[PDB]
Amino acid sequence: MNPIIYTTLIMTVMSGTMLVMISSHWLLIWIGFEMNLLAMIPVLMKNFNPRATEAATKYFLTQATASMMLMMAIIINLLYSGQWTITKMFNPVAMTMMTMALAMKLGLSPFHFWVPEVTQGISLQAGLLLLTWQKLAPLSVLCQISQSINPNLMLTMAMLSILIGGWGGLNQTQLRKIMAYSSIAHMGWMTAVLPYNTTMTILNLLIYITMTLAMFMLLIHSSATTTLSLSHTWNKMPVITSLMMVTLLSMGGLPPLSGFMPKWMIIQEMTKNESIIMPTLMAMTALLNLYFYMRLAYSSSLTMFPSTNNMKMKWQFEHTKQMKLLPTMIVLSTLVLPMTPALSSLN
Amino acid sequence: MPLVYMNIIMAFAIALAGLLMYRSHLMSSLLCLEGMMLSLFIMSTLIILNTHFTLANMMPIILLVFAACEAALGLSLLVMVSNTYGTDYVQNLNLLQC
Amino acid sequence: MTMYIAFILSTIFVIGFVGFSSKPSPIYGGLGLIVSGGVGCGIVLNFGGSFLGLMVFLIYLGGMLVVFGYTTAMATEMYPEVWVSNKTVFGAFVSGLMMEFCMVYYALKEEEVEIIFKFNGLGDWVIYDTGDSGFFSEEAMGIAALYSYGTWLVIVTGWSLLIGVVVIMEITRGN
Amino acid sequence: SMMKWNRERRRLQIEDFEARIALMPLFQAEKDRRVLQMLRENLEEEAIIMKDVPDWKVGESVFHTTRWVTPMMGELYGLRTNEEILSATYGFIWYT
Amino acid sequence: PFFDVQKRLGLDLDRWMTIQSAEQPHKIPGRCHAFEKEWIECAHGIGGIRAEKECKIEFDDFVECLLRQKTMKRLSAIKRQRDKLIKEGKYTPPPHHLGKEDPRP
Amino acid sequence: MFMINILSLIIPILLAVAFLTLVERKVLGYMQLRKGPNVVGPYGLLQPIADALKLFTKEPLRPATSSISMFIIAPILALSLALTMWVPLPMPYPLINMNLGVLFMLAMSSLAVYSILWSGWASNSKYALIGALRAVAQTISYEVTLAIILLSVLLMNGSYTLSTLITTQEHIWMIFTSWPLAMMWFISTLAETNRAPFDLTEGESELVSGFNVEYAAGPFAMFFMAEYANIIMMNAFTAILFLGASHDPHTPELYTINFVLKTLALTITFLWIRASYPRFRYDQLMHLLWKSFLPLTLALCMWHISLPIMTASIPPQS
Amino acid sequence: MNIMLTLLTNVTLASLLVLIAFWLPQLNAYSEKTSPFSMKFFLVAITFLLFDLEIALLLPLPWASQTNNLKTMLTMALFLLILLAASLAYEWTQKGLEWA
Amino acid sequence: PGIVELPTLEDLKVQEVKVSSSVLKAAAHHYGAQCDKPNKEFMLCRWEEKDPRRCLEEGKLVNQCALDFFRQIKRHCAEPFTEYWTCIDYSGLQLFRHCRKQQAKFDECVLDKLGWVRPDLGELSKVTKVKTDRPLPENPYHSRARPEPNPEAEGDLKPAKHGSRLFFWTM
Amino acid sequence: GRIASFLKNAWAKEPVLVASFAIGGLAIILPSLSPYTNYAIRINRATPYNYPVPLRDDGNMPDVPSHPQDPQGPSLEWLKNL
């Protein structure tokens, strides 16, 4: 793929999301989603493999169904209200259909089945774009329509997403699949607070985006897609695996790392609304995510797995490409907890 | 709501169910996608014509513009799948799991 | 009988949708889609949307599915699957017609049917307005305002079509 | 040549639209009177029809607002003959 | 995250098509322009939560104009009872409704 | 009496097709120093009757053995659409007066390709399927230019209503205004009707009989009738669009005569072209359209948009 | 009803001929007569689709010429046409128009 | 809710202008030129009131003025006008172009006998003033009382009482 | 100089593209400098598609005519001369 074309496709993806987050007319929001899909599909297939084509096909089918359901919901809301504006939705059936469509776009369970497969199929960079940028538009749409959202459906989807993200990750030895299941769990965490306080969802999204950016950039730097390939990294770039361990501990939510603050604030807002059982179950279920994070850390940094003789060759050379934002992303992902009260800026 | 709205919503529901229940071929599912788009076009057109929303009579056209874009994307994927497996069968999209 | 032409057409539309939704070989599916597109054009014409309905006849029937057919032809299957070919396809086809009949009968017998929404069995002619549009086709003027009012829509749609050309090229590259 | 003829055509169109403008007020009066008479006939026949039905007000407005609402085709032509209904609904669409 | 860039820069990217009562070509009115205008004027600057109940009358009238569920229900009742009386034979439609008088021009 | 009008449109068009066959045969013969059919009837007037009867009495071979429903629908669709496309044409008063008769004819032409598409596929042969595919591409490729050229010229009409074309060309033929578009449109008609030099579909010299290789007796006759009816209809559309005719409202006969003569001239031009040039190669056909014509049509479309604005000659909408 | 009548009559006539040509001559007594490559050039077909979309977007132009904001209308119409030309030029230069 | 106040049949009975469309179109220009005042008054009433019932009397006056216009035409220019509208009736579109000579005859006769002058192009389409004694409708939409706006912008901003007051943060 | 060589080569080898680009460029440029474009706008404005709703006369509107054929108000003489 020609680099000019690649830049145009990426800018088209970003422009679709900007149209989603900028337009006050439902037709244009759906158009932005359509542009996002159209531009995204070739980006997922930058490196041509049968797995890349399969992942693109699955993603296209899922997003196409989501867009069709979304457009039907928009049409029904038009039929019953005559309003195109993104606002309170005046028909409960349209609200439910729109919620299902947006959840499917976000990969919230029980529409999660495509996330692990697509993430495994595509390369690490395409996975980064899929698991960080693509989440922005549907979350924006949900935040704008938060009041109309029936809390029961959103909460059930969030809890199921947390449970399934925790469960699936335990069984995975593929780094990309682990990241996909972690993304599912964190999306559940974000959508849990959507009915109550949207600023908490934005804060969780920002923290999750920083952590996933850091993790994916570290994986790209280490060029590892499996647990053993990452285990080999300690012999070559020990600093990389050490920072990976710290970021994993953050993703688990351990205090005092930055991963703790989104969970803490989400629990706070839910408790203020008398939700006590739900936050308790979510926090306990996060322990599965923590477990497979810890297993990855054991494999990578805390324990020294066997290397291969040919690694002595890679010792002599140095990494050619530098990802400029990786250090700052690590710092934000790990050491921003003393700075939570600044959560009033995005407010 | 008059019965025509019921019929068209039923058509969309049927097409959606057909899309969600594949049998073998991907082309049949893409046919269901195009069909759902037709239902949406007809529903939107009826709403806009009945309410005399003059400035929204173009919304059905844009919907179809992006319907054909989606169809084209679907066919562009289907050809590659067929090349890699020899058929458009859904069961060959099995390499990625979970 | 001419009082419920719209309803007859909508029923045919639903039947065609059951036809291509049961998934016979994409040839018959295409036939069902073509019939449904023509019938939707009929309904739209009845509601006063001559241009819009005609668009489906050309840019949908002779467009999106004209290539759908060209595609199936390239990927030829050994046998033309029909509704009866698979018991499930035939069974679903019959059940789909039955489902339509049940709601249709209920709507007519029960003045007010409520499947998921509330529908009144009165003929569609009731909802029509008694106003006069004068020396104008409201649909035509609304569609032509896409250039005078919907400049933003024009920009986004044109950009999407260009990026669609680029995207299709890249997807069909195949490396 | 086309420029000359099209300018003349626009002039003639302005003339015809001016004629329509001149005739419009009379048509508006006739249309308003016809609509009101049709509504009155519907109301009277409706009182005769639904006198025996319990808890049915006759001619009760379905809208909360006490403002004139343009009647739908169903109100005006609800109980007329099918030929009148077909004409009023689909005449312009079908006429060719 | 609805960055209201249109309001910040004073650009009417899509708000022209947001409502049916907005300006339309050649001032062609919508079928429910009056009701929609009333509902918007009622629900302006009072917030959605207040608007959901303090303008419920306007919204109900708007919905009725859009869908005419209640009008169709009333007309269906009228047709039902007319058919019932015709079967009982205690009603006879007037000659003008039968087409025996020329309608007013 | 409307049914009487339908029959009056249908049957004479079929008779005209039948005798157009003889006309083609004789014209091709005379341009090849030969004499057309003349034994069968005075000056060969009875030849089409003999041809039709021979075809019908001939064996009805059918080794299709696949989707016989399609193998029967394709001739039906072709003939029905060929007959229908004649309906909106104003000669000078159209049978059905549509505000958008032009787009109706475009849609019907696009649909008519499905007849070739299905016939070739349901035949389930080699030449038939591949030839049918080449057809789809050919018609599809020129459909684009056909639409653009049509839109460009109607920018002067002010509507898609065929009847107003008579008013617009009352003082001069639109060919004087848009002759480059006229040339491209004429070539486009040739491609759409699958006529030489674009007779790739049937393409007897290359493909034994093309899509109709497995069609014989009556169904082949219906395909032939549809082809020739499309030829006459497309030439009539050209005559109405560009070679306008004087219409006296009190005596429509004068316009009808003038229109019929112009359509005959254009059909004779079609036969003349079939005789003169050899057949374009499938590849060269597409090269001539997407790479050579499509551009010029875009430029002329921009020009025909701009001209009414900069010349203050925007036609009246009504 | 006129257009519906025309459609019905034409379809019935054509189908009647198909009947008299598939069954009527099939009676005549006789005897026994016994009796794909993946096209990647289908890209042309797909490009037709995306060009047919612009075709649809361009059809309203005759009525679009009747607006008072003729400047905006002309700018947007030429914008769409120039984008179509750019798409064609891109496919041409990238050898994407590899017909047959 | 309330009962619709449909007017009685007797009040809506008016003398009717029983002339075909071609007849009206033939006299359309002079009819607009002569009968403008009542027509403009009725139009203003209809557009301000937005109720067909409120302006029945103005419609009656419009119909009467049209009848007087046609009575004068019958009295003074009957035959030329009949020829004009018979010419116009033939054309399906009722075009003015085909009947220019009969139009000239009718215009000449009407200018002589009655003094009417045909309005020029772009004249009948002009927005005109109407002086009316009918009061302007106060609430033509019959709108309810608008709900009271929320209180806003109380006054100046001061720092938070003790900062964020978030858990343990002192600032 | 080299531009002339490019134009000559283009006209020799791809005349259709030269014609298309010339026509498109003229279509872009010429309307901007055409005096008659404002005339086209005025013509489109003058078409009386919708009724000219009368306005109540408050006694302070000298410019608005009280009746057609009065000297006050817009004039279409420019179109008639056109």
Curated annotation (Swiss-Prot), chain B:
What UniProt keywords apply to this chain's record, in alphabetical order? Answer: Electron transport, Membrane, Mitochondrion, Mitochondrion inner membrane, NAD, Respiratory chain, Translocase, Transmembrane, Transmembrane helix, Transport, Ubiquinone
Q: How does it sit in the membrane?
A: Multi-pass membrane protein
What sort of enzyme, by top EC class, is this?
Answer: translocase
Q: Which GO terms describe its cellular component?
A: mitochondrial inner membrane; respiratory chain complex I
Q: Which Gene3D superfamilies match?
A: 1.10.287.3510
TM ranges: 1-21, 29-49, 61-81
Q: Name one Pfam family in it.
A: Oxidored_q2
Question: What domain of life?
Answer: Eukaryota
- A GO term, aspect molecular function: NADH dehydrogenase (ubiquinone) activity
State its location(s).
Answer: Mitochondrion inner membrane
Q: How does it assemble?
A: Core subunit of respiratory chain NADH dehydrogenase (Complex I) which is composed of 45 different subunits.
Role summary = Core subunit of the mitochondrial membrane respiratory chain NADH dehydrogenase (Complex I) which catalyzes electron transfer from NADH through the respiratory chain, using ubiquinone as an electron acceptor. Part of the enzyme membrane arm which is embedded in the lipid bilayer and involved in proton translocation.
* Family statement drawn from the similarity comment of this UniProt entry: Belongs to the complex I subunit 4L family.
Q: What is the name attached to this protein's record?
A: NADH-ubiquinone oxidoreductase chain 4L
What is the protein's species of origin? Sus scrofa
Gene symbol here is MT-ND4L
Curated annotation (Swiss-Prot), chain C:
The catalytic activity, as recorded, is: a ubiquinone + NADH + 5 H(+)(in) = a ubiquinol + NAD(+) + 4 H(+)(out)
A Pfam family of the record is Oxidored_q3
Membrane-crossing residue ranges in chain numbering: 1-21, 25-45, 47-67, 88-108, 149-169
Which biological processes are named by the entry's GO terms?
Answer: mitochondrial electron transport, NADH to ubiquinone; mitochondrial respiratory chain complex I assembly
Membrane topology (UniProt): Multi-pass membrane protein
User: What are the alphabetically sorted keywords of the record?
Assistant: Electron transport, Membrane, Mitochondrion, Mitochondrion inner membrane, NAD, Respiratory chain, Translocase, Transmembrane, Transmembrane helix, Transport, Ubiquinone
Asked if the Swiss-Prot or TrEMBL record annotates the protein with the keyword Oxidoreductase, the reply is no
Q: What is its EC number?
A: 7.1.1.2
- For this protein, what is any one GO molecular function term? NADH dehydrogenase (ubiquinone) activity
Q: What is this protein called?
A: NADH-ubiquinone oxidoreductase chain 6
Source species:
Sus scrofa (Pig)
Q: Which gene encodes it?
A: MT-ND6
From Swiss-Prot, chain F:
Report the EC code(s) recorded for this entry: 7.1.1.2
Please report the record's description of how this protein sits within the membrane: Multi-pass membrane protein
Q: Which GO terms of the cellular component aspect does the record hold?
A: mitochondrial inner membrane; respiratory chain complex I
Q: Which UniProt keywords apply?
A: Electron transport, Membrane, Mitochondrion, Mitochondrion inner membrane, NAD, Respiratory chain, Translocase, Transmembrane, Transmembrane helix, Transport, Ubiquinone
Matching entries from InterPro entries are given as:
NADH_UbQ_OxRdtase_su1/FPO, NADH_UbQ_OxRdtase_su1_CS
- Entry's Gene Ontology molecular function annotations: NADH dehydrogenase (ubiquinone) activity
Regions crossing the membrane: 2-22, 68-88, 100-120, 146-166, 171-191, 223-243, 253-273, 294-314
Q: Could you tell me the superkingdom of the organism this chain comes from?
A: Eukaryota
**Location of the protein in the cell:** Mitochondrion inner membrane
- Outline the subunit composition: Core subunit of respiratory chain NADH dehydrogenase (Complex I) which is composed of 45 different subunits.
Tell me the function of this protein: Core subunit of the mitochondrial membrane respiratory chain NADH dehydrogenase (Complex I) which catalyzes electron transfer from NADH through the respiratory chain, using ubiquinone as an electron acceptor. Essential for the catalytic activity and assembly of complex I.
Into which family does the record put it? Answer: Belongs to the complex I subunit 1 family.
What is the protein's given name? NADH-ubiquinone oxidoreductase chain 1
Organism placement in taxonomy: Eukaryota, Metazoa, Chordata, Craniata, Vertebrata
From Swiss-Prot, chain G:
* Main location per the UniProt record: mitochondrion
GO CC, one annotated term: mitochondrial inner membrane
Q: Where are the transmembrane segments?
A: 3-23, 41-61, 72-92
Its record classes its membrane topology as: Multi-pass membrane protein
Q: Which reaction does it catalyse?
A: a ubiquinone + NADH + 5 H(+)(in) = a ubiquinol + NAD(+) + 4 H(+)(out)
What's one GO BP annotation on this UniProt entry?
mitochondrial electron transport, NADH to ubiquinone
Record carries keyword Ligase: no
What's a Pfam family in this record? Oxidored_q4
Q: Which UniProt keywords apply?
A: Electron transport, Membrane, Mitochondrion, Mitochondrion inner membrane, NAD, Respiratory chain, Translocase, Transmembrane, Transmembrane helix, Transport, Ubiquinone
| Subcellular location, record wording | Mitochondrion inner membrane
What assembly does the database describe for this protein?
Core subunit of respiratory chain NADH dehydrogenase (Complex I) which is composed of 45 different subunits. Interacts with TMEM186. Interacts with TMEM242.
Q: Which family does it belong to?
A: Belongs to the complex I subunit 3 family.
Q: What is this protein called?
A: NADH-ubiquinone oxidoreductase chain 3
Q: What is the lineage of its organism?
A: Eukaryota, Metazoa, Chordata, Craniata, Vertebrata
